[PDB]
Write a protein that binds this ligand. Structure first.
Ligand code: 07I
Ligand code: ZN
Ligand code: ZN
Ligand code: ZN
Lengths: 863, 65, 842, 93
């Protein structure tokens, strides 16, 4: 009856949100600290072999919102400052002897959560390590002063308030003022006037401001010294070296521009961001940067700025007499869009992609010698004219290591398609051209990747042929036909308005940029690209493919049979037309009925069925299909020219996102309200709602554990288990389910499946993670083990508290109080404690530390 | 408790409450990595582009009074 | 109105008493009047008066002028009857007005400093802090050049005291405006040919800059050293001394980083070591001692071998300051990597122990502490036995203070290192010296007790051959006219009990216990508590079964001691009773346990926290020893008969019974006492339930359903304070069962707690709000959000007031969570209200 | 009604408590479960107020603690918890 679950991560998250480089070992070697989400990891790149090694990984049980490194004066090792979702700021030091993160300081200032006015989102440190600053997106900002004592141990002071009401923050970064009073540049915007202007004038008249906060050490207080508006709204900042090397001023990245600005008489030197020659992207779309990097040397310094299209440019500042007159930008080769870049000494570059696998490149030539053009802020240009660039393959950099990342996982099916005993995980993940379907085995996980055209959304398995039917849909994208058409149009107006341009256009047409590395053609608010694909699991082959129109977007797919027509199979795909996300507006949808012949290898188009809204869910149902179109749940039967409805329920709350059937109980998932239990009364052909939930939930996936119990996942990283009352009549309505399980994983789950991973063994509930992780929930066998693990949880919650000041019980109950789940990821940290703590906790548990270790390992064997 | 932005009184209007709620939502989106990831997968834009669009929307998200 | 005035205030606030009119008074006079009123409101006034007066005096600081402001402030800052808080109010208002009048204070800078500089040498730490703060605010207000021009002529003033004061103030302004801003002025003054006093004052400025800033100097350490290095070879001797002291202070501030900055100071100091003598030699030695810990291992070895000859020579100096300096230098040398241990053992130890370890050095306390700490730091690197062997024989000296010194040294050494480094002969020397020192102490000293205990515990099982002698000494000491010696003997027993048990001398320890037994009739309370603690230790080491006297005879002897008043006696007796109740409860009848229980119940309202803690532990042990029935019944009776105070102890006892014994035992009868209609006992039962749940915490996850009917009765208007206490019960329930699947019963209780949200009594509405917050953290903010959304927008203004109070509590409690719980509010003709982002589907 | 919480931003100063208010919780006056350590602002721990009790204002003997119930509700995250009297000056006894 009672469901008691135990949570264990099998494959940790692989996506990266933040990355920093520094001398964390305290030696001449450089390491990289990365934030996977709720996990903090340390990596050591070997300059000899050119490969990245993982040295330490720690579950912090929180949300890392900002990460940075700093070093004191004359120090020989960099510390790690972490901005978390607790009301606390933490400073840590890595000790290589114990291979642990030693929490050196932890100071409290506010409440927990990713709050609006509580600092944590932004972190900025003074380049000399004298002080650090934590900041929220609104109003509040705090500054801490760092120093050392007699024993050379880091010390932190009380906070210094630097708040300013009705103010937003786009980014904060510390200015290298040498050894003057430390200063922090902030991108802000005041909304007080926009809120009180009922006409909308003040909304557009308000402009982004760059402000400077100075920290008077002698007077020991923070003050807003200067604040200058900017014509162009900027996304983030870059600190350029100051004092002995370079001027102090900041660099602002904006839409289509990059500006150097400095306090004092320094004029603003702004240079337009280069574009691309004959860009396939929409002309109306702007262009911004996504990340930056800084590399200093005894001689010169430079910057690396990447654009939305993955173009990395090298930026050098030409300064004359404590004044900068020129900003120079040169094309560096192109890599996938990253979230952070790290230029290391010993000549290597780390690219942590926002989605997909990560890369470690080796530098070969910095780009000074080659003939490729160079662009400066002083070159004359008409206002509309911009610089123009043509991308080329990697010449300056060479790939020396590729690190596999399963982020972002959008679908997973666990099954033994390859005739084996242990099943495999079939994972549709990746994004855009970098999408991939991967087969994962174990015997740590082992992966095999097959590339895909567009972002996979759903995939089904054909029972007879064991072949996958995948749908790949992307927004703001072109299809093959429209790509070729637009390329031909650009060539046609290239000829008009010499006549070597005909040869140049022929060269442009005969050149097809690999969309994987140079990006996919991105153009359009409501333009969609959709592809149906058939693929064999064993080999990376694609048996067949179908392309759909430029405004047709697939969101549902199913392989089924019909009683109307024998044992021949059929494939139904749900498509939307003219879907606008924000604000929402859709013309209608279509249901593609395909016959699928040649024992699961080729799709034969049968017919297209118009429908009022997007078909978001399609599930077979005893010789018929159950299709969800908006708030309408219909049962459809195969016709000769159309899909004809037999019964329809209209009273669904908002929008059907998924339906699963057990017997004659259908479990509709709604986007905001959760789980509606409807009953198909065979007699009379009526769909009657008999149950729903008392809580709203943003359902992503679902899974049925029995005839009365359902397991679901939130968009907000939650998992729940809801079960119906035992005495329930499907003809009596207003029955409400009880929530028997609630848990917060810290990551968003998009696939839940009940399975037995090891032949033999035991059942479990495996979930996937949008940030690229795999976890399992295992039920308990005896309640004495339940009490044991609950006491382990209680003791580790107070003796090994989370690394970033979060309360574990508070964290795991982020949106709903925890109910009947044990955190095994926390329990397994028993072996990462100190000997005295392990001894005392084991004595409290009335057994030995090795006994507790074996008891923990037995569950990692029973999975 | 009036200084805490987002709290309301008996004279709080629908617009004030919903603007505070939308702004809180946007801040939470930018804090929670997987929410921003879902958003950036929906719209084929980079994470930084989504963040910039969100911060742009924070001026008057629900619209003028 | 006008605040109160102390007598000394009259002299400064005479004019405010007379009644006049504004227009009669001259414009210059008006300023004086408003400044007087504002400063009186600041000095003697409530925090709101002070805040208002501060804002008013800052917003018009420019309008007033620095003249009258300071000509009235400075007289107040010189009153001999000035409280420290008054000084703090004055320094705060000075900083606030100085931030406003930037250059408007340059005329009065001098007139300020002459009143402020004497604070930089006050014995009070906070006075010096405030003085530094005002000088910093002034140097930021007035220009740097203004400060220099105001304080320049005093550099070569004849009085050395004035020079020191001006140098300290210059250091403060350097910390206020930055080192590089004063770097050229200091570089010039440190080479001033016009006066040796000028260079002396400049090097003093650098020294005080070091002393004040510390580790924030490593930046400009190179600059300061290059500025002051020439002062070591100057013709004048006092400037050489002050340059050595400044180098020493810079090295102390730079520990441990930045040895390379002192690269051009090594050979001058090394030459002056051989050349100079007296105070200058002491300053040179101090500089070298503070500089060595920053060097590399090999170079530290080289420099240490270079200077060790003169160090060992100056070991035998008559100047006590020289002795202290060379001792600190030895401590610094032998605590660094590079100075090998055998080198110290061969070349440094014999003269150290021949010259320093003399009788007269044990008289002065400063030399005492310095020598003790230095010898311990020596043992940390050269070996414990090499140190103890040279001073162990001195444990039998006539001078008691010398024995105390060597005892403290041996104690600290063996506590930091242990006893693995010791052989047999040294162990025998140790035992003999410790026995003689403990046997011949005129004054009861903690040093002897601590040293004995530390040596015994460090030897461990190696002390068995001496245990009969030690116990004979302890027995002979327990028979003495003085009490404090008996207390010391009992404390020694307490500290050595565990090592005795390791040595398996159970008959000796049983003899100790039976000897302590008859000593329970002791009259002096401190020694009685000591022997009680000793009995507790012995009872712990030798089990309850073999303990002599047997528990059945020991505990009744302990029973009347609970009536004693001394806190030490009460604590030790309660701890011993608790030990007996934990492990040896079978040897005592339930009657004696009940009598102790009811003599112990009063001590729950003791003032000392340790006594209440021990009482709780002991009560819980005896309540687990007996069944809960008897104690429960008599506690319920005591609850009925007693009212208000002394019933809190009965409620605490009921809760302790509920925690030890399962609440299955206590809850039914406790709720049946609520069945009778006597409203006072209903209040008592409700208070008992509140504390019971608050105490048992997560233990009450299985009793919400059981208490639910009593609550839903009490939530109805049975009285009013019944509603208050029932809300308190629900609050503690929710906070205790947080995260244990109790959402159903608590959700049910929420429906009966909610209608009481429309109540006017402040105490009961506060209790209802607390209950709602606890239910929020136990159920989740979503259900609360629905309950609140019902009436967030309502025609009735009172409904909106209450519901927005609720919503504010929830929103502050968990604003981030509510992101997932707000309903869909569809946009209308004007606005765009739907969150289109959350409607996305992949 | 004359006594209020400081509620300023707390710093590195550790709260302190006298012999009478030893095991009490600064917020709710509870003895049950001392959980987290109390921090106070720099202004409340300056001068003669160094080592002074947070509730009444007497000679401190033991560190101050929030209780488990307040920690769970994050009442430790609020401002400086030192009680201040709005009807007395700095020199009043
Ligand atoms: C560490 C701790 O306290 O643990 C708790 C669980 C134990 C006990 C507890 O709370 N016990 C509580 C706490 C408190 C001690 C309480 C109040 C008693 C007072 C104010 C007595 C005041 C009188 C007033 C006058 C004029 C003179 C005088 O001598 O004292 O009593 C009650 C029994
Ligand atoms: Zn007190
Ligand atoms: Zn305070
Ligand atoms: Zn409390």
């Amino acid at each position: 009856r009672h469901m008691f679950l135990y949570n264990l991560t099998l494959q940790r998250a692989t996506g990266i949100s933040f990355a920093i480089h520094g001398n964390f070992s305290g030696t001449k070697q450089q390491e990289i600290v990365v934030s996977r989400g709720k996990i903090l990891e340390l990596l050591r790149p070997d300059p000899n072999t050119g490969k990245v090694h993982t040295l330490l990984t720690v579950e912090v049980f929180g949300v890392i919102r900002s990460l940075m490194a700093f070093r004191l004066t004359g120090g020989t090792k960099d510390y790690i400052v972490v901005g978390s979702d607790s009301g606390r700021i933490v400073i840590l030091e890595y000790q290589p002897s114990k291979n642990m993160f030693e929490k050196i300081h932890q100071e409290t200032f506010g409440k927990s959560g990713c709050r609006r006015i509580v600092p944590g989102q932004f972190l900025a440190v003074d380049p000399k390590g004298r002080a650090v600053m934590i900041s929220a997106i609104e109003k509040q900002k705090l500054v801490y002063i760092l120093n050392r004592d007699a024993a050379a141990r880091l010390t932190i002071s009380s906070p210094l308030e630097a708040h300013k009401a009705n103010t937003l923050v786009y980014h904060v970064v510390g200015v290298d003022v040498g050894f003057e009073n430390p200063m922090f540049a902030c991108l802000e915007m005041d909304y007080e006037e926009a809120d009180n202007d009922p006409t909308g004038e003040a909304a557009a008249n308000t402009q982004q401001t760059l402000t400077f906060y100075e920290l008077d050490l002698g007077l020991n207080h923070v003050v807003r010294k200067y604040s200058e508006p900017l014509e162009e709204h900027g996304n983030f900042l870059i600190t350029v070296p100051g004092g002995s090397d370079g001027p102090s001023g900041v660099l602002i990245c904006s839409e289509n521009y990059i500006t150097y600005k400095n306090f004092g008489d320094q004029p603003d030197i702004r240079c337009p961001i280069p574009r691309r020659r004959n860009d396939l992207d929409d002309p109306e779309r702007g262009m911004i940067f996504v990340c930056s990097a800084t590399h200093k040397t005894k001689s010169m310094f430079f910057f690396l700025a990447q654009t939305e299209q993955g173009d990395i440019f090298k930026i050098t500042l030409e300064t004359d007499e404590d004044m900068v007159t020129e900003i120079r930008l040169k094309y560096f080769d192109t890599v996938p869009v990253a979230a952070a870049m790290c230029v290391l000494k010993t000549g290597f570059l780390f690219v942590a992609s926002e989605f997909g696998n990560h890369y470690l490149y080796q530098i070969a030539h910095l780009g000074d010698d080659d003939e490729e053009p160079e662009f400066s802020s002083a070159m004359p240009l008409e206002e509309g004219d911009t610089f123009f660039f043509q991308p080329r393959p990697l010449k300056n950099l060479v790939l020396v290591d590729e690190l596999d990342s399963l982020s972002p996982i959008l679908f997973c099916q666990i099954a033994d398609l390859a005739n084996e005993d242990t099943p495999q995980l079939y994972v549709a993940c990746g994004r855009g051209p970098r999408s991939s379907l991967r087969v994962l085995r174990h015997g740590v996980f082992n992966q095999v990747a097959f590339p895909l055209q567009y972002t996979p959304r759903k995939f089904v398995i054909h029972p007879e042929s064991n072949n996958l039917i995948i749908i790949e849909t992307d927004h703001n994208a072109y299809t093959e036909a429209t790509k070729a058409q637009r390329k031909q149009q650009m060539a046609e107006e290239m000829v008009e308005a010499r006549e070597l341009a005909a040869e140049m256009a022929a060269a442009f047409l005969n050149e097809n940029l690999p969309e994987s590395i140079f990006g996919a053609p991105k153009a359009g608010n409501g333009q969609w690209a959709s592809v149906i694909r058939v693929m064999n699991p064993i080999q990376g082959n694609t048996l067949d493919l179908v392309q759909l129109e430029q405004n047709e977007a697939a969101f549902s797919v199913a392989v089924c049979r019909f009683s109307n027509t024998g044992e021949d199979w059929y494939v139904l795909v749900g498509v939307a037309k003219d879907l606008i996300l924000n604000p929402r507006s859709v013309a209608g949808g279509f249901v593609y009925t395909y016959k699928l012949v040649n024992n699961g290898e080729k799709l034969e188009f049968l017919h297209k069925t118009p429908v009022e809204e997007v078909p978001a869910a399609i599930a077979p149902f005893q010789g018929r299909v159950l299709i969800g179109v908006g708030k309408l749940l219909r049962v459809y039967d195969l016709g000769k020219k159309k899909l004809l409805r037999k019964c329809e329920n209209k009273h669904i709350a908002n929008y059907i996102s998924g339906i699963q059937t057990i017997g004659h109980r259908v479990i509709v998932s709604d986007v905001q309200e959760s789980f509606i239990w409807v009953r198909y009364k065979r007699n009379e052909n009526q769909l009657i709602i008999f149950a729903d939930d008392t809580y709203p939930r943003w359902v992503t996936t679902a899974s049925l554990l029995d005839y009365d119990t359902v397991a679901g996942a939130d968009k907000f990283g939650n998992i729940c288990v809801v079960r119906l009352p035992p005495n329930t009549n499907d003809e009596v309505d207003s029955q409400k389910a009880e929530v028997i399980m609630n848990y917060h994983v810290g990551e968003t789950v998009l696939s839940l499946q009940k399975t037995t991973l090891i032949p033999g063994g035991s059942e479990s509930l495996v979930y996937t993670t949008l940030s690229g992780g795999i976890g399992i929930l295992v039920p308990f066998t005896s309640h004495e083990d339940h009490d044991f693990f609950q006491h382990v949880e209680m003791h580790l919650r107070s003796e090994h508290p989370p690394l970033c000041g979060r309360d574990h019980l508070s964290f795991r109950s982020y949106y709903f109080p925890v109910k009947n789940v044990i955190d095994g990821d926390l329990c397994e940290q028993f072996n990462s404690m100190e000997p005295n703590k392990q001894k005392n906790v084991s004595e409290e548990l009335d057994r030995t530390p090795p006994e507790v270790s074996k008891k923990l390992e037995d569950i990692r064997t029973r999975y | 408790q009036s200084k805490y932005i987002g709290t309301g009184h008996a004279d709080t209007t629908k617009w004030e409450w919903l603007v505070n709620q939308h702004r809180d939502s946007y801040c939470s989106y930018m804090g929670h990595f997987d929410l921003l990831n879902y958003f950036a997968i929906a719209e084929n834009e980079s994470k930084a582009r989504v963040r910039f669009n969100l911060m742009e929307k924070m001026l008057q998200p629900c619209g003028p009074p | 109105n006008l605040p109160f005035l102390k007598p000394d205030d009259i002299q400064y606030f005479d004019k405010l008493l007379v009644d006049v009119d504004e227009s009669t008074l001259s414009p210059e006079e008006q300023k004086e009047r408003k400044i007087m009123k504002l400063l009186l409101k600041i000095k003697n006034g409530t925090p709101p008066m002070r805040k208002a007066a501060l804002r008013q005096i800052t917003d018009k600081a420019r309008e007033f002028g620095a003249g009258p402001l300071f000509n009235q402030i400075l007289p107040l800052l010189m009153s001999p009857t000035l409280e420290d808080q008054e000084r703090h109010l004055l320094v705060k208002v000075i900083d606030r007005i100085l931030y406003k009048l930037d250059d408007l204070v340059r005329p009065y800078v001098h007139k300020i400093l002459v009143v402020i500089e004497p604070l930089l040498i006050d014995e009070d730490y906070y006075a010096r802090v405030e003085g530094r703060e005002i000088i910093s605010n002034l140097a930021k207000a007035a220009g740097l050049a203004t400060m220099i021009s105001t304080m320049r002529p005093d550099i070569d003033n004849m009085d050395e005291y004035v020079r020191n004061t001006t140098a300290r103030a210059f250091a403060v302004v350097a910390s206020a405006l930055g080192i590089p801003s004063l770097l050229p002025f200091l570089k010039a003054v440190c080479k001033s040919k016009k006066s040796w006093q000028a260079r002396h004052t400049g090097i003093k400025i650098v020294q005080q800059i070091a002393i004040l800033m510390g580790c924030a100097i490593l930046p400009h350490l190179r600059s300061l050293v290059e500025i002051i290095e020439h002062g070591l070879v100057d013709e004048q001797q006092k400037v050489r001394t002050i340059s050595a002291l400044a180098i020493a202070a810079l090295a102390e501030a730079a520990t441990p980083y930045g040895i390379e900055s002192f690269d051009s100071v090594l050979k001058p100091l090394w030459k002056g070591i051989r050349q100079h003598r007296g105070k200058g030699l002491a300053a040179f030695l101090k500089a070298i001692g503070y500089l060595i810990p920053l060097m590399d291992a090999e170079y530290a070895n080289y420099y240490t071998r270079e200077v060790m000859l003169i160090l060992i020579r100056e070991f035998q100096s008559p100047d006590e300051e020289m002795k202290k300096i060379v001792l600190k230098v030895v401590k610094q040398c032998c605590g660094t990597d590079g100075v090998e241990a055998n080198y110290i053992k061969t070349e440094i130890l014999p003269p150290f122990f021949k010259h320093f370890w003399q009788h007269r050095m044990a008289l002065d306390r400063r030399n005492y502490r310095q020598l003790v700490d230095t010898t311990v730091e020596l043992a940390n690197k050269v070996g414990a036995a090499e140190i103890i062997s040279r001073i162990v024989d001195d444990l039998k000296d006539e001078a008691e203070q010398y024995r105390k010194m060597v005892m403290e040294t041996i104690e600290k050494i063996m506590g930091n290192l242990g006893a693995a480094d010791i052989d047999h002969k040294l162990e025998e020397q140790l035992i003999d010296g410790i026995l003689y020192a403990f046997q011949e102490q005129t004054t009861e000293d903690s040093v002897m007790l601590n040293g004995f205990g530390t040596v015994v515990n460090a030897l461990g099982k190696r002390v068995k051959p001496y245990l009969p002698q030690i116990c004979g000494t302890v027995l002979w000491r327990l028979n003495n006219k003085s009490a404090k010696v008996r207390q010391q003997a009992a404390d020694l027993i307490s500290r050595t009990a565990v090592v005795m048990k390791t040595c398996q001398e159970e008959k000796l320890m049983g003899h100790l216990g039976v000897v302590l037994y008859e000593y329970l009739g002791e009259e002096y309370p401190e020694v009685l508590g000591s022997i009680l603690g000793a009995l507790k230790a012995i009872v712990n080491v030798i089990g309850m079964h073999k303990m002599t006297p047997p528990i059945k005879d020991l505990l009744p002897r302990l029973t009347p001691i609970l009536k004693n008043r001394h806190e030490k006696v009460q604590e030790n007796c309660i701890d011993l009773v608790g030990r007996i109740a934990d492990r040896g409860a079978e040897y005592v009848s339930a009657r004696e346990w009940m009598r102790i229980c009811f003599e112990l119940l009063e001590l729950l309202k003791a003032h000392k926290k340790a006594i209440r803690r021990a009482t709780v532990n002991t009560f819980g042990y005896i309540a687990k020893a007996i069944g809960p029935h008897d104690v429960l019944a008599t506690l319920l009776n005591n609850l009925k008969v007693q009212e208000r105070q002394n019933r809190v102890c009965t409620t605490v006892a009921i809760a302790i019974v509920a925690e030890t014994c399962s609440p299955f035992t206590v809850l039914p009868a406790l709720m049946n006492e609520y069945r009778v209609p006597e409203l006072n006992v209903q209040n008592g039962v409700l208070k008992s339930l509140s504390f019971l749940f608050e105490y048992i915490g997560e233990m009450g996850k299985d009793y919400i359903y059981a208490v639910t009917p009593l609550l839903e009765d009490a939530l109805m208007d049975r009285d009013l304070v019944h509603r208050q206490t029932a809300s308190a019960v629900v609050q503690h329930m929710s906070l205790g069962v947080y995260g244990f699947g109790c959402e159903d019963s608590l959700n049910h209780l929420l429906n009966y707690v909610w209608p009481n949200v429309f109540e006017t009594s402040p105490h009961v509405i506060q209790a209802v709000m607390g209950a709602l917050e606890g239910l929020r953290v136990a159920i989740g903010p979503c259900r609360m959000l629905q309950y609140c959304l019902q009436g967030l927008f309502h025609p009735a203004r009172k409904v909106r007031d209450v519901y927005w109070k609720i919503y504010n509590s929830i929103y502050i409690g968990s604003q981030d969570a509510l992101i997932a719980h707000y309903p869909r509010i569809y946009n209308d003709d004007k606005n765009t209200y739907i969150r289109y982002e959350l409607d996305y589907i992949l | 009604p004359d006594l209020i919480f400081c509620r300023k931003q707390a710093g590195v100063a550790i709260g302190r408590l006298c012999e009478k208010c030893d095991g009490k919780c600064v917020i709710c006056d509870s003895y049950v479960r001392p959980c987290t350590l109390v921090r106070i602002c720099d202004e409340c721990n300056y001068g003669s107020y160094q080592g002074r009790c947070v509730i009444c204002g007497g000679p401190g003997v033991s560190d101050a603690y929030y209780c488990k119930e307040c920690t769970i509700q994050e009442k430790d995250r609020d401002g400086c918890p030192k009680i201040v009297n709005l009807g007395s000056s700095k020199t009043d006894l």
